[PDB]
Amino acid sequence: GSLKSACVVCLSSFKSCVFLECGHVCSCTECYRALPEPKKCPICRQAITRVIPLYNS
Ligand SMILES: [Zn+2]
Ligand SMILES: [Zn+2]
């Protein structure tokens, strides 16, 4: 379920965020909270309904 591969957006930090939409785990907390927009799932383009942060790097 959880995994910590490379954050697909930055590619520097691991992914530390499961996007509660579809269960895609792909972003990192800092990427999310830093960028303010309504963010879309980087993999599937669904709007994010909630973010379940994983406290990792
Ligand atoms: Zn990131
Ligand atoms: Zn998705």
User: What separation in Å is there between the alpha carbon of 56 and the centre of ligand 2?
Assistant: 20
Name which of 49, 34, 21, 54 is nearest 9 in CA terms: 34
Q: For the chain, what are the domain ranges? A: 1-57
CB–CB of 54/13 below 8 Å? no
Q: Which pair of tokens denotes residue 45? A: 């383009």
* CATH level 3 topology of 1-57: Herpes Virus-1 (3.30.40)
Please provide the DSSP assignment of 9-54 as one string: TTSSSBP-EEEETTTEEEE-HHHHHHS-S--B-TTT-PBPSEEEE-
For residue 27 the two structure tokens come to: 């972003």
Q: How far is the CA of 2 from the centre of ligand 2 (A)?
A: 14
Smallest Cα–Cα separation from 30: which of 43, 50, 13?
Answer: 13
43 Cα: distance to centroid of ligand 2 (angstroms): 5
Expressed in angstroms and rounded, the spacing between residue 25 Cα and the centre of ligand 2 is 8
- Please give the method by which this entry was determined: NMR
Let me know: does 16 contact 5? Beta carbons within 8 Å.
Answer: no
